[PDB]
Every structure is written in C-alpha cells, then in structure tokens.
Amino acid sequence: TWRDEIRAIAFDVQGTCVDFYQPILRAGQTVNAAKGLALDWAKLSGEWRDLYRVALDEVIAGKRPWIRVDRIYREALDVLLDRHGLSEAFSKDERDELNTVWSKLDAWPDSVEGLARLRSRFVTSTLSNAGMAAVVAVVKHAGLPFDALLTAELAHSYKPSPAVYQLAVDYLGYPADTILMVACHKYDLKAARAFGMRTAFVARPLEFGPAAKVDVAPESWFDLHVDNFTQLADALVPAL
Amino acid sequence: TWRDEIRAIAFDVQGTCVDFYQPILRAGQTVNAAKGLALDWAKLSGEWRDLYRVALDEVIAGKRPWIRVDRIYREALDVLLDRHGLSEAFSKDERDELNTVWSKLDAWPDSVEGLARLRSRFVTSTLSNAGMAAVVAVVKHAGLPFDALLTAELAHSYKPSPAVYQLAVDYLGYPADTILMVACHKYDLKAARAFGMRTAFVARPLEFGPAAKVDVAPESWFDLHVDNFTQLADALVPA
C-alpha cells in the first residue's frame, strides 16, 4: 500500500493541532477585567479573523507585499478596535500585548499523544502559514513533539503556493509522494494533493468556537479523514 | 550576570553536539569487511575532511556556487576514491550509501542531558552549516532535544556570513544580544560576537579522533568556556 511508502508527515498547526478560540476568550476576559469593559470576545474573535483573511487574500493576490501572519493580525486589530470606537482606550502597548495571544495556544486533547506516537515511526514536521518565531513559540508552549519546524515564512509565500509544500521536500529530504500532509482546512490539502503529497483531513468542529458550523464533510480525494490524532495514530502506527 | 538577559540559545551541531569521527570509523569497518579491503579509515577521515574544507573555502570565496554540505562531502568522496585508486571498486550507489554517514552522527556523552536542561529554561535551536534535511536526520538519530532546527541552507550562504546569524534573530524572534551562540569552533563564535550574540565555547578535543591536537585554549572574548554541555547547563540553569 501507499501507507508503507510514507516517510514524513507535515502538520498545519493553528487550528489543526492547537485551539485558538479559548485562548482568545481567556485573553479578552483578562482585558475586560483590567479595563472594566464587557466586550463579547466570542464575536470579536470572528471579527478579527475575518479582517485577517481579507488582508491575507490581498497578499496572496499580490496586491500587497509579503507580511508575516502575526503582523497581519496586529494591523487588523487596529481596524477592529476602531470599527468599535475603542482606539483611544487601547494604547499601542496594550494592543501589542493582546496580539501575543497567537503565540500561546492550547493543544487539542488528542494532539500531544498522537503526535508522539507518529514521531516514533515517521519524520514529523510543522508546515503552517504562521511565522517561524510564532510557530516555535506555539509548539514550545503546547509541548508538541516534532522533528522539524517549517513554515511558509521560509518561502515568503502563503499557501496554496507550491513553494510552501516544496519546503517540506527540500528541508525534510523526501519526495512529495512520501509525505503525508495533515490539516483541518480543505484548501490546504487540495493544494498538497495537487503538489503530489498524500493528504489527511482532521475534523476540528470547535476551531471557531461552539457557535460556528465548520465544514467537516468528506471528500472522495482525501487519503485519510479522521476525527482526531488518536484515530490518526491508530491508523498509521497500530500500538498493540 | 548576563544569564538572565539570554532568551534563546543557538547550537552548532556537527562536532559541537555530535561526534563524526567514530561514525566514519564504523562505516569504514563495514566497507572493509564487505569488499575485502584494509583501508585506513582513521587517515581517510582526515583526508576527506581536508578535501571538504578546501571545497567549502572555494564556496565562501565565491569561486563556486552554494551547494549543500552533504553534496560537498559527496563530491569530495569521488576525489578521495580517485586518489586511492578506488573508483572502479565503488559504484555510485555504494558511494551514496557511504555518504549517508553525515546524517548518522552520534551524541557526545554529555549532549542529551545538557540540551534538555537548557530547553527547560530557554528557547533552543540548531544553527549549523549543514543542510536542513541532514540536521533533521542527525537530531532525530541522536535524540537531541531542540525547540527549532535552523541551518545555513535557509540563507544559501555559509558561516561566517551575517545572513546565517540573522536566521536565528528572524526565525526565533529575539534580537542578537539576547541569543547565546554555542560552538566548538572559534571562527563561528568570533563572527557571532561581531554580530551581537553572546558566545559559549565548548571544548571537543576528540572531534578529529585520538591523534589530533585541537585548539581548546581559552580566549578573553568568550562569554563562557566549558568542557561539555554539563558545565554549560550548570552555568546557565543553576539549582
């Protein structure tokens, strides 16, 4: 089978391995307390994220120079606070400190043990859009075990550019057809498949909190489609 | 003193963290047995290193374009076999297999525990000349703990280029004066100091085998000078 030819597994990080919704809720509640406000961060996080993607789509479309993911979020925070008329309640230092949330994310309950099992049999690596320094911090904070840390910053191009997937080929040292790409975002796997990798979709229905409705429907072209990393490890590294 | 200003520590890998002398001797015993040869791998070790050094110097001087470390060694192996009249004895496949030795290097006895102690208090990273895939392989083979793996391949230029040290700043996210550079090679530390990092020299007197006389003498400009990673961790993560 193709499962026996896999040598390396590359993982998206934000969303796929770690939760950012509860970190934002926690960070925003410490802000609500220290400044006596009552902002609904459950809705604010969706607002922030929607501003981020507009700016990201402009970078991808070439309408704007390359900029690191954390800096996109930092600038969208300025727009978010202004569209809510709190620009003068938040100094730059408070905005900078609120934006550090992206480097302190929570492992999903299945992530660490499943990553550890996979590391015992494969070469494992990150491959996400975020900046290298942010992913270094996220991986360290959440205790994720990986053999390598790669991100799109090493290509100064964002997914779905083939140059991002070529980073795994060049820097892990394996051809595309021996790398499994793991993500909870379908467009990432669609690009990885076009590039020649095998694909594994992970359902993360809480990625945007309890109220959003996440697309977790199957696709015929996935190679694997799992609920969580326990199932992923049990599929690729049967333990008993 | 300055140890609470440090946020990240960057490590050279080949030599500093891992031994590459015994892996050559080990690979050579296997070759000798397979082919019925009696090659002197203690001497071939040094000859291969010397050929590598000449080729790397030509890259740094701009006489030949940037090429990955393992490919420099692979080309030097062809030259080495030609000098010893062995080109008919070794096929391309056999040379390729012999050259995998550079991804199969062994931790010095002190490396794993020292790295673990440091990672508990600092962000730790590799920063070496070798290719990314080779350092991924060496770190996994020797079980070295790191928070990040960076190499000069990410700049396509070799030490002492400032572009290499800038990788640690850009990709770990700390300014140079909060990064400590650890190496057993003085020229690397000299460049890192000029770039703005703190420096820690680790003496590796067996790096070239039991007969060589390695420069491990103290220098006034080192921030730290230690004999192994045990003493390195003792200096930076006390009690």
XYZ file of C-alpha atoms in Angstrom:
479
model
C 0.000 0.000 0.000
C 0.884 3.707 -0.097
C 0.885 3.799 3.719
C 4.116 1.792 3.744
C 5.841 4.324 1.477
C 5.154 7.296 3.784
C 8.368 8.618 5.323
C 7.357 12.047 6.639
C 4.227 13.734 7.972
C 3.756 17.525 7.775
C 1.179 19.226 10.016
C -0.648 22.506 9.859
C -0.526 23.952 13.382
C -3.053 26.701 14.154
C -6.457 25.005 14.218
C -5.146 21.578 13.188
C -3.002 20.871 16.287
C -3.968 23.735 18.620
C -7.081 25.709 19.567
C -7.045 29.493 19.301
C -10.686 30.147 20.266
C -10.384 29.541 24.017
C -7.029 31.416 24.199
C -8.733 34.474 22.670
C -11.664 34.193 25.095
C -9.246 33.952 28.027
C -7.096 36.853 26.827
C -10.127 39.046 26.194
C -11.584 38.327 29.619
C -8.384 39.457 31.340
C -8.714 42.645 29.255
C -12.391 43.102 30.169
C -11.384 42.847 33.834
C -8.356 45.165 33.867
C -10.190 47.885 31.887
C -13.742 47.440 33.224
C -15.273 46.626 29.842
C -17.729 43.982 28.667
C -16.611 43.179 25.134
C -18.035 39.964 23.669
C -14.818 38.315 22.539
C -16.698 35.298 21.153
C -17.963 37.635 18.432
C -14.832 39.808 18.405
C -12.606 36.846 17.525
C -14.686 36.117 14.426
C -14.454 39.806 13.524
C -10.678 39.789 13.998
C -10.297 36.584 11.982
C -12.422 37.941 9.115
C -10.254 41.075 8.926
C -7.157 38.872 8.887
C -8.337 36.856 5.903
C -9.143 39.921 3.812
C -5.572 41.141 4.276
C -4.162 37.649 3.704
C -6.118 37.277 0.463
C -4.571 40.555 -0.709
C -1.048 39.291 -0.009
C -1.847 36.053 -1.843
C -3.284 38.004 -4.782
C -0.086 40.066 -4.993
C -1.903 43.345 -4.295
C 0.411 43.927 -1.322
C 3.940 42.913 -0.239
C 4.604 39.849 1.871
C 3.912 40.389 5.574
C 4.185 37.952 8.492
C 0.988 36.428 9.876
C 1.300 37.948 13.359
C 1.804 41.396 11.807
C -1.355 40.937 9.739
C -3.262 40.182 12.933
C -1.638 43.165 14.656
C -2.787 45.571 11.940
C -6.300 44.105 11.716
C -6.546 44.686 15.471
C -6.201 48.413 14.769
C -9.102 48.246 12.302
C -11.148 46.102 14.684
C -10.712 48.446 17.650
C -11.540 51.485 15.511
C -14.666 49.980 13.930
C -15.792 49.543 17.546
C -14.629 53.004 18.635
C -12.153 51.914 21.320
C -8.970 53.157 19.621
C -8.145 55.539 22.486
C -8.965 53.048 25.228
C -6.097 50.860 23.915
C -2.527 52.131 23.756
C -0.093 50.534 21.320
C 1.493 48.558 24.164
C -1.885 47.118 25.162
C -2.576 46.193 21.535
C 0.868 44.601 21.275
C 0.267 42.576 24.419
C -3.179 41.441 23.295
C -1.676 40.280 19.991
C 0.725 37.926 21.795
C -2.227 35.539 22.170
C -1.293 33.960 18.824
C 1.887 32.527 20.372
C 0.122 30.880 23.379
C -2.405 28.384 22.003
C -3.946 25.256 23.551
C -3.291 21.723 22.353
C -6.449 19.851 21.433
C -6.821 16.980 23.954
C -5.667 14.375 21.394
C -2.751 16.294 19.895
C 0.321 15.613 22.057
C -0.072 11.842 22.474
C -0.938 11.333 18.803
C 1.992 13.451 17.608
C 4.298 11.488 19.923
C 3.140 8.142 18.528
C 3.646 9.367 14.970
C 7.104 10.724 15.778
C 8.142 7.271 16.961
C 7.590 5.857 13.429
C 7.915 8.808 10.966
C 9.792 12.063 10.421
C 7.276 14.699 11.580
C 7.275 18.429 10.938
C 5.148 21.526 11.052
C 4.150 23.226 7.812
C 1.860 26.175 8.505
C 1.308 29.728 7.282
C 2.359 31.437 10.520
C 5.780 32.982 11.060
C 8.637 30.744 12.188
C 9.034 32.528 15.534
C 5.335 32.222 16.335
C 5.271 28.517 15.492
C 8.418 27.933 17.573
C 6.614 29.582 20.492
C 3.291 27.776 19.917
C 4.980 24.364 19.688
C 7.040 25.023 22.814
C 4.097 26.378 24.836
C 1.761 23.479 23.952
C 4.506 20.831 24.273
C 4.007 19.485 20.766
C 6.682 16.956 19.713
C 8.049 17.449 16.173
C 11.274 16.532 14.389
C 11.273 19.763 12.341
C 9.605 23.198 12.360
C 8.855 24.632 8.910
C 6.508 27.433 7.935
C 5.523 29.414 4.869
C 7.793 32.262 6.018
C 10.717 30.197 4.711
C 9.244 30.657 1.218
C 7.843 34.216 1.748
C 4.751 32.862 0.019
C 1.486 31.675 1.540
C -0.484 28.502 0.975
C -1.663 27.302 -1.548
C 1.566 28.282 -3.336
C 3.524 25.157 -4.410
C 6.640 26.791 -2.936
C 5.346 26.155 0.602
C 4.947 22.410 0.016
C 8.365 22.285 -1.686
C 9.853 23.392 1.652
C 8.977 20.000 3.116
C 10.532 18.191 0.153
C 13.756 20.193 0.290
C 14.200 20.517 4.050
C 12.937 17.130 5.237
C 14.616 15.361 2.319
C 11.765 13.203 0.952
C 9.858 13.357 -2.348
C 6.284 14.623 -2.385
C 4.692 11.182 -2.763
C 6.277 10.002 0.543
C 4.942 12.945 2.591
C 1.524 12.987 4.249
C 0.022 16.454 4.732
C -2.295 16.789 7.747
C -4.722 19.698 8.106
C -8.190 20.701 9.222
C -8.506 23.129 6.257
C -9.549 21.630 2.928
C -7.871 24.154 0.590
C -4.503 23.280 2.139
C -4.994 19.581 1.382
C -6.294 20.385 -2.107
C -3.014 22.187 -2.841
C -0.901 19.471 -1.179
C -2.629 16.830 -3.297
C -2.050 18.842 -6.492
C 1.598 19.142 -5.440
C 1.763 15.326 -5.159
C 1.536 14.621 -1.400
C -0.844 12.266 0.355
C -3.489 14.008 2.461
C -5.153 13.557 5.867
C -8.135 15.714 6.869
C -8.743 16.156 10.607
C -12.173 17.298 11.738
C -11.872 20.225 14.159
C -15.520 21.229 14.668
C -14.700 23.637 17.537
C -11.982 25.566 15.654
C -14.135 28.732 15.652
C -15.975 28.178 18.924
C -19.266 26.458 19.711
C -21.499 28.651 17.516
C -19.813 28.283 14.114
C -20.707 25.486 11.694
C -17.463 24.034 10.328
C -17.351 22.092 7.056
C -16.330 18.558 8.057
C -17.991 16.778 5.129
C -15.982 14.019 3.419
C -14.186 14.414 0.117
C -13.507 11.470 -2.168
C -9.963 12.684 -2.796
C -8.719 12.672 0.823
C -6.390 9.790 1.510
C -7.289 9.796 5.208
C -10.125 11.506 7.060
C -10.014 11.291 10.857
C -11.825 12.664 13.880
C -8.666 13.245 15.908
C -4.993 12.350 16.188
C -5.688 9.241 18.271
C -7.519 7.769 15.297
C -4.726 9.036 13.015
C -2.041 7.298 15.069
C -4.097 4.133 15.400
C -4.447 4.086 11.616
C -0.731 4.573 10.857
C 1.065 3.174 13.967
C -1.102 0.372 15.473
C 0.212 0.122 19.024
C -0.736 -3.330 20.349
C 25.328 38.062 35.447
C 24.172 38.289 31.821
C 22.486 34.886 32.007
C 19.077 36.420 32.687
C 19.351 38.570 29.554
C 19.531 35.424 27.399
C 16.278 34.281 25.796
C 17.450 31.814 23.122
C 20.482 29.578 22.604
C 21.700 28.555 19.133
C 23.913 25.480 18.733
C 26.302 24.363 16.068
C 25.640 20.652 15.519
C 28.350 18.660 13.718
C 31.276 18.484 16.160
C 29.684 20.665 18.853
C 26.718 18.387 19.649
C 27.733 15.175 17.866
C 30.867 13.174 17.020
C 31.552 12.413 13.351
C 34.897 10.620 13.827
C 33.655 7.305 15.211
C 30.768 7.170 12.658
C 33.368 7.253 9.833
C 35.449 4.559 11.504
C 32.297 2.485 11.991
C 31.159 2.933 8.387
C 34.656 2.065 7.185
C 34.827 -1.227 9.069
C 31.641 -2.249 7.263
C 33.096 -1.271 3.870
C 36.394 -3.063 4.563
C 34.546 -6.263 5.506
C 32.178 -6.127 2.524
C 34.860 -5.508 -0.114
C 37.786 -7.418 1.390
C 39.766 -4.185 1.753
C 42.015 -2.908 4.520
C 41.594 0.837 4.099
C 42.899 3.053 6.918
C 39.767 4.978 7.815
C 41.460 6.917 10.603
C 43.593 8.516 7.907
C 40.836 8.669 5.276
C 38.709 10.539 7.837
C 41.210 13.385 7.916
C 41.766 13.325 4.160
C 38.032 13.603 3.477
C 37.754 16.492 5.951
C 40.660 18.280 4.245
C 39.057 17.937 0.809
C 35.769 19.195 2.225
C 37.489 22.223 3.780
C 39.144 23.200 0.503
C 35.836 22.985 -1.369
C 33.919 24.913 1.304
C 36.570 27.631 1.212
C 36.008 27.936 -2.548
C 32.267 28.367 -1.951
C 32.875 31.088 0.631
C 35.304 32.812 -1.762
C 32.639 32.793 -4.484
C 34.590 30.545 -6.854
C 31.759 28.002 -6.933
C 28.057 28.373 -6.131
C 26.424 27.464 -2.851
C 25.939 23.696 -2.564
C 24.622 21.687 0.414
C 27.206 20.333 2.877
C 26.358 16.693 2.171
C 26.863 17.349 -1.543
C 30.280 18.912 -0.856
C 31.238 15.750 1.037
C 29.806 13.543 -1.736
C 31.935 15.258 -4.373
C 34.992 15.126 -2.106
C 34.435 11.382 -1.755
C 34.829 10.962 -5.534
C 38.150 12.822 -5.334
C 39.272 10.743 -2.352
C 38.485 7.445 -4.101
C 40.284 8.576 -7.272
C 43.426 9.474 -5.295
C 43.448 5.995 -3.730
C 42.799 4.117 -6.996
C 39.349 3.002 -5.823
C 36.981 4.470 -8.429
C 36.438 1.055 -10.048
C 35.725 -0.511 -6.637
C 32.828 1.824 -5.639
C 29.663 2.259 -7.693
C 27.522 5.389 -7.454
C 25.067 3.513 -5.218
C 27.861 2.401 -2.867
C 29.306 5.926 -2.597
C 25.835 7.340 -1.905
C 25.368 4.820 0.912
C 28.782 5.560 2.421
C 27.986 9.291 2.327
C 24.825 8.796 4.445
C 27.241 8.775 7.396
C 26.855 12.556 7.724
C 23.192 12.066 8.742
C 24.097 9.312 11.259
C 26.264 11.141 13.797
C 26.404 10.274 17.493
C 25.768 12.475 20.514
C 28.732 13.139 22.749
C 28.033 11.516 26.166
C 27.019 14.877 27.721
C 24.844 16.294 24.936
C 21.332 14.983 25.576
C 21.009 15.842 29.254
C 22.657 19.246 28.811
C 20.347 20.182 25.941
C 17.326 19.028 27.940
C 18.266 21.153 30.955
C 18.747 24.213 28.763
C 15.490 23.701 26.877
C 13.631 23.761 30.200
C 14.697 27.419 30.664
C 15.441 28.815 27.170
C 14.312 28.607 23.566
C 16.909 26.332 21.967
C 17.753 25.929 18.283
C 20.317 24.475 15.968
C 22.283 26.886 13.798
C 24.796 24.981 11.694
C 26.262 24.959 8.191
C 24.820 21.562 7.211
C 21.698 21.090 5.122
C 18.277 21.209 6.759
C 17.442 17.601 5.899
C 20.757 16.365 7.282
C 20.303 18.244 10.566
C 16.707 16.961 10.845
C 18.150 13.467 10.406
C 21.078 13.933 12.814
C 18.883 15.425 15.548
C 16.409 12.548 15.247
C 19.127 9.870 15.075
C 20.986 11.140 18.150
C 17.795 12.079 20.031
C 18.830 15.710 20.615
C 16.102 17.931 22.095
C 15.600 21.334 20.415
C 12.762 23.830 20.030
C 13.779 24.694 16.435
C 16.072 23.467 13.663
C 17.787 26.192 11.620
C 20.712 25.877 9.236
C 22.711 27.991 6.818
C 20.763 26.390 3.949
C 17.950 28.817 4.834
C 20.256 31.668 3.733
C 22.149 29.827 0.961
C 25.361 31.224 2.406
C 27.787 29.772 4.898
C 29.213 30.931 8.184
C 30.690 33.472 8.861
C 28.052 35.279 6.716
C 25.846 37.620 8.787
C 22.887 36.187 6.867
C 23.305 32.931 8.823
C 23.204 34.555 12.261
C 20.253 36.708 11.164
C 18.240 33.486 10.702
C 18.215 32.963 14.467
C 17.018 36.531 15.037
C 14.316 36.403 12.364
C 13.090 32.860 12.971
C 13.386 32.578 16.753
C 12.170 36.156 17.258
C 14.812 37.611 19.598
C 17.390 40.343 18.972
C 21.005 39.235 18.697
C 22.055 40.442 22.133
C 19.538 38.031 23.758
C 20.875 34.987 21.851
C 23.796 32.858 23.019
C 25.781 31.039 20.327
C 27.367 27.694 21.297
C 30.117 26.083 19.230
C 33.346 24.142 19.443
C 34.781 26.139 16.511
C 36.278 29.529 17.332
C 35.671 31.277 13.982
C 31.918 30.729 14.372
C 31.950 32.353 17.804
C 34.102 35.229 16.549
C 31.511 36.016 13.872
C 28.581 35.600 16.293
C 30.195 38.036 18.738
C 30.659 40.640 15.989
C 27.002 40.098 15.031
C 25.956 40.848 18.630
C 25.358 37.439 20.260
C 26.881 36.117 23.466
C 29.294 33.214 22.911
C 29.978 29.906 24.642
C 32.934 27.763 23.570
C 32.593 24.009 24.206
C 35.897 22.158 24.049
C 35.646 18.998 21.900
C 39.210 17.638 21.950
C 38.193 14.344 20.266
C 36.426 15.985 17.300
C 39.100 14.729 14.849
C 39.957 11.472 16.589
C 42.511 10.435 19.174
C 45.679 11.653 17.417
C 44.815 15.269 16.571
C 45.736 18.290 18.718
C 42.659 20.516 18.823
C 42.732 24.190 19.806
C 40.757 24.340 23.059
C 42.725 27.202 24.607
C 40.808 29.968 26.429
C 40.053 33.310 24.784
C 39.351 36.560 26.617
C 36.377 37.422 24.403
C 34.310 34.265 25.069
C 31.433 34.830 27.455
C 31.690 31.173 28.551
C 34.338 28.464 28.099
C 33.307 24.949 29.184
C 34.408 21.360 28.596
C 30.987 19.829 27.878
C 27.261 20.547 27.950
C 27.057 19.560 31.606
C 29.142 22.591 32.552
C 27.249 24.705 30.013
C 23.927 23.880 31.665
C 25.454 24.366 35.119
C 26.425 27.926 34.154
C 23.008 28.903 32.760
C 20.382 26.923 34.692
C 21.563 26.805 38.310
C 19.991 24.799 41.172
